[PDB]
Design a protein around this ligand. Structure first.
Ligand SMILES: Nc1ncnc2c1ncn2[C@@H]1O[C@H](COP(=O)(O)OP(=O)(O)O)[C@@H](O)[C@H]1O
Ligand SMILES: [Mg+2]
Length: 237
């Protein structure tokens, strides 16, 4: 398929890595070959969340021109799921040229059905370089008006940049009695609501376990919502 999807947001801590990891496993479980990419250069967490904790070669090495991207592709314990991990040390962060993200990622298009890019939030250099490496964008936001409007702005930017905006995910819903309900959130976002991921301790547990909740705790509300999201993502093909 070769669909490159940028997982983005207007703010950090909204669930980008969580959505990237769970969606990857959900899609992989449906038989699709997935590459989870950690484009969050200053806060590499994706590989750890997928249980790959010891990679010697990372995207940072590739972006520094010190390694071929082929050598930064690792297996994960999940069927059909591979990862392009990021380094955590500052020296690696410094030497990774973010401007080379688009060319590096797109060169892998023919080897996967889905390439999900975990992006840092915002509109600064690293964020833009990562988001612009994708062809499609999945907006991730929380039930906060400020988070919604900020994420909306990112979507508009990406839309103008040429990316197909698939829609958005309303994550961490139910965390507070002040949360904006889905119907209203969609009315605000101006893009299709693809899934509501509830606030669920099971998701946090998966994060700490290094095994996405979608697989670690398959009967949790969070797991089931991600399975549905994966179904929706495939339909929008
Ligand atoms: N729906 C949810 N329910 C409970 N905890 C969640 C949910 N979504 C994310 N989290 C937790 O919130 C934290 C931030 O998520 P993360 O994906 O790392 O954010 P981001 O990549 O946007 O910075 C993580 O520790 C994660 O386990
Ligand atoms: Mg993250």
């Amino acid at each position: 398929m070769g669909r490159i999807i940028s997982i983005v947001s207007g703010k950090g801590g909204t669930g980008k890595t969580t959505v990237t990891a769970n969606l990857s496993v959900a899609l992989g479980d449906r038989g699709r070959k997935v590459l989870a990419v950690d484009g969050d250069l200053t806060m590499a967490n994706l590989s750890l969340v997928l249980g790959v904790d010891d990679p010697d070669v990372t995207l940072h090495d590739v972006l520094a021109g010190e390694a071929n991207v082929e050598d930064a592709i690792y297996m994960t314990q999940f069927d059909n799921v591979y990862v392009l991990p990021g380094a955590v040390d500052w020296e690696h962060v410094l030497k990774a040229d973010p401007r080379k993200l688009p060319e590096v990622i797109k060169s892998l298009k023919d080897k996967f059905d889905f390439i999900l890019i975990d992006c840092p939030a915002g509109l600064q250099l690293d964020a833009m370089s990562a988001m612009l490496s994708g062809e499609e964008a999945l907006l991730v936001t929380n039930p906060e008006i400020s988070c919604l409007t900020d994420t909306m702005k990112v979507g508009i930017v990406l839309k103008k940049a040429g990316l197909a905006i698939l829609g958005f995910v309303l994550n961490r819903y139910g965390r507070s009695d002040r949360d904006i309900p889905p119907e209203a959130a969609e009315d605000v976002m101006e893009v299709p609501l693809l899934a509501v991921i509830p606030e669920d301790p099971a998701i946090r547990e998966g994060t700490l376990e290094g095994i996405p909740a979608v697989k670690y705790k398959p009967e949790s509300k969070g797991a089931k919502a991600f399975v549905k999201l994966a179904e929706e993502i495939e339909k929008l093909a």
